[PDB]
Design a binder for this molecule. Structure first.
Ligand SMILES: COC1=C(OC)C(=O)C(C/C=C(\C)CCC=C(C)C)=C(C)C1=O
Length: 183
């Protein structure tokens, strides 16, 4: 069973399938705002960057997931594993445990050395308050659910990376043809 997982993963079709998934989610939402005139927040962008970044990594790793490239693409996959998950909880703690508007919060201050936000404010500029609820499933906010899918992706890499057959293979199964004339 596991042996196949490494096979289905080493397949491009599968890789392309993972891309469409994150896309079907990023797009489906990009329409909800254009329909319900929703107002994105600072945190929302952070979440979008976490996945948006991974999405790319999936397209880069799918270039040769059979070569050392693994650790090369896993650089972004893992980075989001500990940091993405370690930061998500913090965001959930606030929502589940708010607090006076003392911390003070407003427009996000983009960096002056990373033209990634400044040169691209179209998908970085924040507008509204963070932690607000725009829509939920089964009574849960998107941020929470997305976290559910967020960990799944992180686990897929950890397993797809360790899949390394190491060196203790098996060559082939025992008893292939044996006694069977007419080849
Ligand atoms: C204000 O409206 C919203 C947006 O403006 C279009 C967003 O961009 C995003 C970010 C979208 C993400 C993280 C993926 C969507 C899928 C899930 C399961 C969250 C969210 C959450 C949102 O609420």
């Amino acid at each position: 069973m596991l042996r196949f997982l490494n096979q289905a993963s080493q397949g491009r079709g599968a890789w392309l399938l993972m891309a469409f998934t994150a896309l079907a989610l990023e797009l489906t939402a990009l329409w909800f705002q254009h329909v319900m005139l929703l107002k994105p927040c600072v945190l929302s962008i952070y979440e979008r960057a976490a996945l948006f970044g991974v999405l790319g990594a999936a397209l880069i790793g799918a270039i040769a997931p059979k070569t050392p490239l693994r650790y090369v693409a896993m650089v972004i996959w893992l980075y989001s594993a500990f940091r993405g998950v370690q930061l998500t909880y913090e965001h959930t703690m606030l929502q589940l445990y708010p607090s006076p508007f003392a911390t003070s919060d407003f427009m996000v201050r983009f960096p002056e050395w990373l033209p990634l936000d400044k040169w691209v404010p179209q998908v970085f500029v924040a507008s509204g308050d963070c932690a607000e609820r725009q829509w939920d499933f089964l009574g849960l906010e998107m941020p929470q659910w997305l976290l559910g899918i967020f960990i799944a992706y992180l686990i897929v890499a950890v397993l797809v990376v360790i899949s390394q057959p190491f060196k203790a293979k098996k060559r082939d199964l025992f008893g292939r043809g044996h006694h069977h004339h007419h080849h």
